[PDB]
């Protein structure tokens, strides 16, 4: 009678509920697509722990989350929002109805704040835990106590079968549950040469499986938004040059997608229609698309990683674990016989991939971790019953950018900045910029400014339309800042009536200036709960240049020539970025801030603003 019924979850399910029944902790182990995100709610929902109280399902990923969400609220015939809702950092999708709620790690980390026995839950499903998410790993050291003030609490750990043995011990032995799997050999094609244009390389092979291969969808594991928008323009540029190919649709995945975006991907094309999916990681475990039969494999992620050659973090592309290429290579193995084209040889496989990914927790920045854990009560790190305990050094350096920041005192205490900066679901950094943009008088646009910072770039540059773009990019510089450049974009967007059309006429990603306005609105409501004043500095825009000066003091710079500047913290040699506003000035300030780091040819310098040499002398 219903799709539901051809998912292998369905079969175990009394025998699942009987095991949930007689243990307060549950391992759920089933490979992706045998139903456990959708399904194991239903279950708890049915057996009746919706009457005492809530039934939470917890992910790493937004998308999947919100995706879930909306696929049981269907399968269960209610309004999502309502009996099935969803909260993510940005957006509660809940009412006093909600009995299951899907959410991300970070949202019911923050619940645990003021309800640290979690007590409007019946029931958690930690789902995805396999990817060892710094917040997964977080939840897992909370719920060891929790479980112990709480004896109905029932815990449900969800895992794809990698790295799916160790939770067991962890929670003192608890009983393991397998979902037995079906999957096709799938023909794993290694590219013959290390390729130097995956992006290139990529689309000539969608375009080789397109013409040439029988009927089934392609899935393209790319890193991010940018190189996801490069490669389905560049698809759609050279199949429209072929010779009556088939048709194509083409649909991305990225964590910051709209939900509008989201729904396209679970959509069946027209008959005879061939799907693309050009995908994050999202797409290695967190969700299904049917009918996948061909993979190509980029062999990338993209991270926030400390760089030696910087003694600081740099967004860059990083090589993936031969696990992760194992599961990658896996998704072209549910309806057939699938193909996974590699990107990267044999040998590159062999010596330059690790056989696992490091735990989230041993290779990532804690400083959002030391400030919740502080706020949570914990004093050190590791204090916490941690699966994999952070390694020292990161944790000390942690502890000195929170205590340079002035959320911990010189005794490394939390302070009351410490405690606001907790309130906003943000870098420590970005959070007290918001904070200190009140004393400055420019909370208005601060919020704006943070808003746009948080959310992918606005500045839309096709590459069939470079010059033009370019032109239409200048005509918003504020050459002394790309923040300021940011809110000027902005606020012209809002002067437009917020329109779609304006955006496409001036080269900028509407999706983005939405994705903006949502986050601008959730914060504009956090800064009112901390009772602060909204107030705008009108024209003068200089005491914006020297509130971010305050902020990204630890991240200021000094002119070196050539477009160089030497980070005074470090010493170390970074790089202004060609498509900087600060470009349009008369000549390179001898002072900056910037937002991040990223590698792409060279460690570049990304949201740069000019800073007077006074302002950095009043500051430490
Ligand atoms: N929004 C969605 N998110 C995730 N899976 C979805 C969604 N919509 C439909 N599905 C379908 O649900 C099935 C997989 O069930 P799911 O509970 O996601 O399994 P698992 O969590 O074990 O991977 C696939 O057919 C997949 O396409
Ligand atoms: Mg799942």
């Given at each position: 009678k219903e799709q539901r019924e051809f998912l292998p979850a369905f079969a175990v399910r009394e025998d699942l509920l009987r095991v949930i029944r007689d243990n307060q902790v549950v391992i759920v182990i089933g490979e992706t697509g045998s139903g456990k995100t959708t399904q194991l709610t239903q279950f708890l929902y049915e057996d009746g722990y919706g009457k005492t109280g809530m039934i939470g399902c917890t992910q790493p990923r937004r998308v999947a989350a919100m995706s879930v969400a909306k696929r049981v609220a269907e399968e269960m015939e209610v309004k999502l929002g309502t009996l099935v809702g969803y909260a993510i950092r940005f957006e509660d999708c809940t009412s006093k109805e909600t009995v299951i709620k899907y959410m991300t790690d970070g949202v019911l980390l923050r619940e645990s704040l003021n309800e640290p026995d979690l007590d409007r839950y019946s029931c958690i499903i930690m789902d995805?835990?396999?990817?060892?998410?710094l917040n997964t790993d977080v939840l897992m050291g909370l719920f060891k106590k929790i479980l112990q003030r709480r004896r109905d609490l029932k815990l449900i750990i969800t895992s794809a079968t990698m790295n799916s043995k160790r939770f067991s011990d962890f929670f003192g032995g608890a009983p393991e549950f397998t979902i037995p799997g079906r999957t096709f050999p799938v023909d794993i094609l290694f590219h013959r040469s290390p390729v130097e244009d995956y992006v290139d390389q990529a689309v000539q092979q969608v375009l080789a499986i397109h013409v040439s291969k029988p009927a089934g969808d392609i899935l393209v594991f790319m890193t991010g938004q940018e190189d996801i928008e490069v490669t389905c323009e560049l698809i759609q540029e050279r199949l429209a040059a072929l010779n009556d190919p088939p048709k194509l649709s083409v649909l991305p995945i990225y964590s910051q997608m709209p939900a509008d975006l989201q729904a396209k991907i679970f959509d069946r094309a027209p008959p005879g229609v061939r799907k693309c999916i050009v995908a994050t990681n999202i797409a290695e475990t967190s969700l299904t698309v049917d009918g996948i039969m061909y993979v190509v494999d980029c062999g990338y992620s993209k991270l926030k990683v400390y760089n030696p050659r910087m003694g600081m973090d740099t967004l860059q592309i990083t090589p993936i674990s031969q696990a992760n290429a194992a599961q990658r290579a896996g998704r072209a193995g549910r309806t057939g016989p699938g193909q996974a084209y590699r990107l990267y040889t044999e040998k590159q496989f062999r010596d330059e991939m690790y056989m696992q990914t490091i735990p989230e927790i041993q290779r990532t920045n804690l400083s959002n971790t030391v400030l919740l854990l502080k706020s949570l009560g914990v004093k050190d790190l590791l204090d916490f019953d941690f699966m994999d305990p952070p390694p020292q050094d990161t944790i000390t350096t942690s502890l000195y950018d929170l205590w340079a920041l002035g959320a911990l005192d010189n005794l490394g205490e939390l302070t009351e900045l410490g405690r606001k900066m907790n309130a906003f679901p943000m870098d420590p950094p970005l959070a007290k910029l918001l904070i200190m943009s009140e004393e400055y008088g420019c909370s208005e646009e601060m919020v704006t400014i943070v808003s746009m910072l948080s959310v992918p770039n606005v500045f839309y540059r096709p590459k069939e339309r470079q010059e033009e773009s370019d032109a239409a990019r200048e005509k918003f510089?504020?050459?002394?800042?790309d923040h300021l450049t940011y809110l000027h974009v902005y606020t012209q967007w809002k002067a437009n009536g917020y329109s779609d059309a304006w955006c496409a006429r001036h080269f900028l990603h509407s999706k983005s200036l939405r994705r903006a306005r949502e986050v601008r609105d959730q914060l504009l409501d956090i800064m009112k709960m901390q009772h602060m004043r909204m107030v705008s500095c009108g024209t003068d825009w200089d005491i914006i240049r020297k509130c971010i000066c305050s902020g990204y003091y630890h991240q200021a710079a000094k002119v070196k020539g050539i477009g160089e500047y030497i980070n005074l913290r470090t010493s170390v040699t970074v790089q202004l970025h060609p498509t900087s506003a600060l470009y349009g000035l008369g000549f390179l300030p001898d002072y900056v801030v910037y937002h991040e780091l990223i590698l792409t040819s060279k460690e570049y310098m990304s949201t740069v603003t000019a800073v007077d040499p006074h302002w950095l002398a009043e500051l430490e």
């Amino acid at each position: 009678k219903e799709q539901r019924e051809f998912l292998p979850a369905f079969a175990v399910r009394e025998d699942l509920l009987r095991v949930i029944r007689d243990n307060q902790v549950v391992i759920v182990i089933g490979e992706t697509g045998s139903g456990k995100t959708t399904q194991l709610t239903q279950f708890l929902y049915e057996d009746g722990y919706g009457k005492t109280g809530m039934i939470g399902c917890t992910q790493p990923r937004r998308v999947a989350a919100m995706s879930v969400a909306k696929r049981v609220a269907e399968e269960m015939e209610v309004k999502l929002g309502t009996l099935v809702g969803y909260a993510i950092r940005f957006e509660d999708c809940t009412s006093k109805e909600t009995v299951i709620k899907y959410m991300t790690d970070g949202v019911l980390l923050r619940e645990s704040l003021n309800e640290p026995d979690l007590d409007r839950y019946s029931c958690i499903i930690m789902d995805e835990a396999h990817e060892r998410a710094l917040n997964t790993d977080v939840l897992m050291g909370l719920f060891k106590k929790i479980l112990q003030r709480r004896r109905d609490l029932k815990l449900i750990i969800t895992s794809a079968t990698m790295n799916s043995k160790r939770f067991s011990d962890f929670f003192g032995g608890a009983p393991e549950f397998t979902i037995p799997g079906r999957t096709f050999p799938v023909d794993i094609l290694f590219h013959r040469s290390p390729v130097e244009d995956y992006v290139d390389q990529a689309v000539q092979q969608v375009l080789a499986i397109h013409v040439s291969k029988p009927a089934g969808d392609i899935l393209v594991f790319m890193t991010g938004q940018e190189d996801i928008e490069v490669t389905c323009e560049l698809i759609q540029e050279r199949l429209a040059a072929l010779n009556d190919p088939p048709k194509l649709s083409v649909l991305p995945i990225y964590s910051q997608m709209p939900a509008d975006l989201q729904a396209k991907i679970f959509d069946r094309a027209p008959p005879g229609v061939r799907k693309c999916i050009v995908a994050t990681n999202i797409a290695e475990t967190s969700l299904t698309v049917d009918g996948i039969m061909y993979v190509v494999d980029c062999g990338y992620s993209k991270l926030k990683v400390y760089n030696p050659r910087m003694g600081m973090d740099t967004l860059q592309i990083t090589p993936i674990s031969q696990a992760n290429a194992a599961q990658r290579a896996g998704r072209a193995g549910r309806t057939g016989p699938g193909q996974a084209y590699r990107l990267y040889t044999e040998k590159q496989f062999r010596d330059e991939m690790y056989m696992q990914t490091i735990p989230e927790i041993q290779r990532t920045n804690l400083s959002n971790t030391v400030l919740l854990l502080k706020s949570l009560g914990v004093k050190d790190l590791l204090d916490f019953d941690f699966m994999d305990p952070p390694p020292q050094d990161t944790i000390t350096t942690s502890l000195y950018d929170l205590w340079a920041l002035g959320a911990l005192d010189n005794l490394g205490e939390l302070t009351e900045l410490g405690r606001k900066m907790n309130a906003f679901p943000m870098d420590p950094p970005l959070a007290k910029l918001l904070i200190m943009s009140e004393e400055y008088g420019c909370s208005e646009e601060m919020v704006t400014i943070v808003s746009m910072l948080s959310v992918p770039n606005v500045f839309y540059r096709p590459k069939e339309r470079q010059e033009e773009s370019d032109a239409a990019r200048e005509k918003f510089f504020v050459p002394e800042s790309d923040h300021l450049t940011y809110l000027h974009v902005y606020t012209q967007w809002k002067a437009n009536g917020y329109s779609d059309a304006w955006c496409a006429r001036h080269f900028l990603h509407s999706k983005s200036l939405r994705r903006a306005r949502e986050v601008r609105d959730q914060l504009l409501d956090i800064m009112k709960m901390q009772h602060m004043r909204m107030v705008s500095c009108g024209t003068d825009w200089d005491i914006i240049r020297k509130c971010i000066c305050s902020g990204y003091y630890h991240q200021a710079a000094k002119v070196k020539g050539i477009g160089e500047y030497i980070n005074l913290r470090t010493s170390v040699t970074v790089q202004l970025h060609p498509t900087s506003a600060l470009y349009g000035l008369g000549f390179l300030p001898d002072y900056v801030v910037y937002h991040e780091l990223i590698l792409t040819s060279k460690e570049y310098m990304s949201t740069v603003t000019a800073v007077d040499p006074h302002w950095l002398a009043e500051l430490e």
